[PDB]
């Protein structure tokens, strides 16, 4: 997917990617420690998978 949608879904910052889930269908792979931040300051963004 990342080759086929290069520069299409690829964000270059975390909070713009936080915004990009907040806009549309977006999954935003990062590490869980920053996921532990954004989830615990927003009751709208949870963590599928562990």
């Amino acid at each position: 997917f990342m080759s086929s949608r290069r520069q299409s879904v690829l964000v270059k910052s975390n909070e713009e990617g936080i915004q990009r889930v907040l806009t549309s269908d977006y999954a935003f792979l990062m590490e869980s420690t920053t996921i532990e931040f954004v989830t615990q300051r927003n009751c709208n963004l949870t963590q599928i998978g562990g």
């Binding site: 086929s4 949608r5 290069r6 520069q7 299409s8």
Partner: protein, 51 residues
């Protein structure tokens, strides 16, 4: 969509007028001649979707 294609202006390899047409295709998004000519040629019938 399925991919992210685009069409390009065909020029010979090492075109003499490459930048004469390169920044010329850069300037057609400025006033939007790509966009102000987009509403005409793609919309031959204003198809009334209701369903």
């Amino acid at each position: 969509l399925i991919d992210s294609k685009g069409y390009g202006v065909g020029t010979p390899m090492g075109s003499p007028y490459r930048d004469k047409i390169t920044i010329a295709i850069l300037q057609l998004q400025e006033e939007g001649k790509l966009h102000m000519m987009k509403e005409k040629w793609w919309r031959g019938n204003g198809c009334p979707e209701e369903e």
